[PDB]
Design a protein around this ligand. Structure first.
Ligand SMILES: Cc1cc(C)c(S(=O)(=O)N2CCC(C(=O)NC3CCCCCC3)CC2)c(C)c1
Ligand SMILES: Cc1cc(C)c(S(=O)(=O)N2CCC(C(=O)NC3CCCCCC3)CC2)c(C)c1
Ligand SMILES: [Mg+2]
Ligand SMILES: [Mg+2]
Lengths: 548, 548
């Protein structure tokens, strides 16, 4: 055979503690006759309560009392009597919520898909109408985004040992029997797959099943390296648009429910720079609002410089909350977004549930010295002087959009840009390659997404964030007597050689309850460089500080 | 004078229990020297802790301990000692949350705006960084959407008796002193308004203040009738877009935070048909997702009939939840939307937190009789036979979009359409007016919004919802053994002469825990006919059943 499709059972394969493993444990726990609960569950066979449930003829809450019945009649003819407060509902609630995603099996499914396989879930399951049904809904949700097809018995009206369901499977997959693998924890469910000619795998322990699937598929599945978190396909996201002013519309991508978390990218980036965290934080119980900041992507990019001072940027973000009907949001920002997010904490604390910045420290304005001098004080900020003169940086950055982003988006050990003496050399790329190699951090496709976005407005808007140093300074000086006393996290990146960790060292003087995070071996593009640890740090901090 | 601007103080005018009325009560409660708490609050005058707070130099949490200090020093030189567990923080938390919107004053502000006035709030307030700051944030949010300007002392760095702030007020309003009224509970704040020439009103009891504002403005404010709920301006809403299929994008308008409530309009309507409930439910603590259903507005309208059978409509709504990262939503629908929403409960109960329909009852398919006969059984459903032949209803409904909607959208006592014998007469409008009068229920502007929307795709898509009777019937027959056991509400409209209340009378046979609502004097367009009672019924049911 030559396989191009993988089908996975749910209970017992993609989801562990199998629910028959609660049927079984409960018998022992209560010292019931062996298999009594499993007798009652299968009573009637093809035309019994359970098959009707699995076929979607009745709902789970309809089925509970039919099963209680069968536990009575099996408890009559098996010659016992049930314990006084015996509750089938309670046994299944525990079983159902005890069940979790079998992560190695999901990873194996991912890998196969990644290498061109069509994947599907085939499961005997039920229309769940219990009060506590959201648990399983969530689980099914997380799973289904990773597969081409989810085939539920109660949705198709067919059940799983019936040959007809495998005919439906094959037709859904557009495959010949011998082109597909099918893993299931039950022998009887595999026999029919075999008769059409499908490869099959009895799934007992996960590891051995994968070994078989490795052999039969010829792709490394077990022991393979730690994989990146789920990314976003732009065209599958919910896109949102809010006018904040007559000529200014802000765009964002939205995913998940619960407390609002507003993500704010830096220069020269995009909502897409959060691609690795949007799914993770949604999964962690949050409503992510990933912005195209003003000047970028599908947000408006008005040409005037002062449209990008921190004060009008912040007010607009308040209007954004206003129009969305949000009293507050958690504000997490990187680079320029990080700066803005501190200023939202200082100027609109009532609207900020919590504040977090990646890389960008909070340094207060020096009310004596001008910032245009402070920026000459540090050689590594020379590039910001090159950004001042409208037009010059635009022409360089916009003449080869692919080159610009390939050159910028690199890990700390892949540098092709000497940040010092950029005014002298006369360009950010003066002695850098015309066709740079692709970084480890980004696929050609991902880069081209940025290229696509910057073809809308280019770099005027984005560069203007650097062109209000004096105005931002005057504004910031109004906050010099305040402190940030709302919940706040600072995340430093070891090998960000411009927004260096030591710049953050006095931040607790103004943010006394500041919580920190630090990431080893992480360059300036924190999110796409160390997505796993970023997700881990933020989710930890969100749950402890932005919640309860 | 001739006024065209009204300015309202917040504390004591737009918001009641004034916070000085907690300062005062607390002194009495604890038997402290009269005014001690108010001495400590104003200690230092123009350069005291409180003025610095009001000017935004320090935050509220910075101010608490400075005020505790002043309560100590006033408690020294006034010759007493404070009670053992005296907490300034606790006194203000209670005061701040005890304060609510003064509804009659807000109504008066509304009215004035409605009649052309520019309105503004001018308030001495603070950067609020308390743990419990969301309370006040919410309040400020509800208020500010109803005014042209919110001027906060701590935002502008000026405070309210200082003449400079009134210069800023006047400049913000683009008005001459004598063109503006200003109401405040404090005498000193009015003197400066007077010196520039402003009309002023010392606000003691609300009713008398309004009487003065009635006299000075010449518009009836007090005792005026019960006003409609807040509506939506389309261009101020957050618009959202989700691709559910290659050729099908669904659009919706989104407002509020908390549990997801998905609103589903009927035929031939729009997200805009929920204009009266979107704000109310957001305010009640919900995240409203008001759909353009498939076939309408900015949602895709594919021409094929079968793209509109209930089964593909429901699946698409699941994908909509999937892509948005929502495990569940509360589903509330009207007319056709109502039908779909029951079928979401029957086929995807795990995804439906709760279900509610306006007007549309749940009747199960008769598995013997064909629906195309059942629809001939009732003379009032004759119009549905007229909708069957593709093209005929389209030409009539699309030839004068304004006439179509003016003719349709009418209250029960304004009927211009005989629903019976539409096939016979050969048209829904055969003997109806070319230029109908405007209903009580809709402004010319509101109608034109529908006209604008239907110019995109017209009526093919919308009419196709009626063109899958046989297909919907076959599908529905699969549910004949199920019951709806999730939380469910049915709202009947007395004078809907087609979706009549008596059609609902057996619904508890399949929905045993069904909760009901009934609206007197309400026609078919429930939402725009009786918005107040609809909002009241849904919010009540949401809080008791879709929540905790
Ligand atoms: C070696 C090197 C690496 C990198 C990433 C760049 S960069 O692409 O131009 N770059 C882009 C973003 C830049 C940046 O603007 N950083 C922050 C902005 C927030 C306020 C505080 C001032 C500085 C920092 C680094 C440069 C110029 C050199
Ligand atoms: C007197 C009169 C009043 C009204 C509102 C109309 S109507 O505009 O055509 N109209 C539009 C919507 C229509 C309607 O489609 N109602 C429901 C749809 C859900 C499934 C059950 C079948 C019937 C009901 C009433 C008609 C034709 C006559
Ligand atoms: Mg299984
Ligand atoms: Mg006042």
């Amino acid at each position: 055979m030559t396989l191009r499709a993988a089908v996975f059972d749910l209970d017992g394969v993609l989801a562990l503690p199998a629910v028959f493993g609660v049927l079984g444990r409960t018998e022992e726990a209560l010292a019931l006759p062996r298999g009594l609960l499993n007798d009652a569950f299968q009573k009637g066979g093809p035309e019994g309560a359970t098959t009707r449930l699995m076929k979607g003829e009745i709902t789970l809450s309809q089925w509970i009392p039919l099963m209680e019945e069968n536990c009575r009649k099996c408890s009559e003819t098996a010659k016992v009597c049930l314990p006084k407060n015996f509750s089938i509902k309670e046994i299944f609630d525990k079983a159902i919520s005890a069940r979790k995603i079998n992560r190695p099996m999901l990873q194996a499914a991912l890998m196969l898909r990644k290498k061109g396989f069509t994947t599907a879930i085939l499961t005997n399951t039920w229309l769940d109408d219990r009060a506590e049904r959201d648990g399983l809904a969530q689980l099914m949700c997380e799973l289904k985004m990773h597969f081409d097809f989810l085939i539920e018995s109660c949705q198709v009206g067919m059940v799983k040992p019936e040959p007809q369901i495998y005919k439906f499977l094959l037709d859904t997959l557009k495959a010949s029997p011998s082109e597909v693998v099918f893993l299931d924890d039950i022998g009887a469910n595999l026999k029919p797959a075999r008769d059409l000619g499908m490869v099959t795998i009895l799934v007992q322990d996960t590891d051995t099943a994968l070994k078989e699937l490795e052999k039969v598929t010829g792709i490394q599945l077990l022991n393979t390296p730690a994989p990146l978190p789920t990314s976003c396909n732009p065209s599958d996201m919910s896109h949102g648009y809010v006018t904040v002013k007559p000529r200014v519309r802000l765009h964002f991508v939205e995913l998940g429910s619960g407390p609002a978390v507003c993500l704010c990218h830096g220069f020269p980036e995009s909502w897409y720079s959060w691609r690795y965290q949007i799914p993770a934080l949604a999964q962690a119980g949050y409503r992510v609002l990933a912005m195209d900041m003003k000047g970028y992507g599908e947000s408006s990019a008005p040409p005037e410089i002062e449209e990008y001072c921190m004060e009008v940027l912040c007010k607009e973000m308040v209007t954004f909350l206003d129009k969305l009907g949000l009293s507050q949001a958690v504000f997490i920002g990187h680079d320029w977004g990080g700066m803005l997010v501190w200023y939202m904490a200082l100027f609109y604390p009532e609207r900020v549930r919590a504040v977090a910045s990646l890389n960008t420290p909070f340094i207060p304005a020096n009310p004596n010295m001008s910032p245009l001098e402070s920026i000459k004080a540090n050689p590594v900020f020379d590039y910001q002087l090159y950004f001042q003169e409208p037009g010059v940086a635009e022409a360089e950055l916009e003449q080869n959009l692919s080159r610009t982003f390939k050159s910028l988006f690199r890990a700390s050990d892949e540098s092709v840009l000497s940040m010092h003496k950029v005014c002298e050399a006369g360009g950010l790329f003066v002695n850098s390659p015309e066709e740079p190699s692709l970084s480890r951090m980004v696929t050609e496709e991902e880069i081209q997404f940025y290229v696509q976005q910057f073809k809308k407005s280019g770099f005027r808007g984005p560069l203007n964030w650097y062109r209000n140093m004096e105005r931002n300074w005057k504004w910031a000086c109004k906050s010099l007597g305040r402190k940030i006393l709302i919940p706040a996290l600072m995340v430093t990146a070891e090998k960000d050689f411009v927004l260096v960790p030591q710049m953050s060292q006095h931040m607790e003087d103004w943010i006394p309850h500041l919580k920190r995070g630090h990431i080893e071996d992480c360059g300036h593009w924190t999110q796409m460089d160390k997505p796993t640890e970023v997700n881990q740090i933020l989710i930890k901090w969100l749950d402890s500080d932005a919640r309860n």
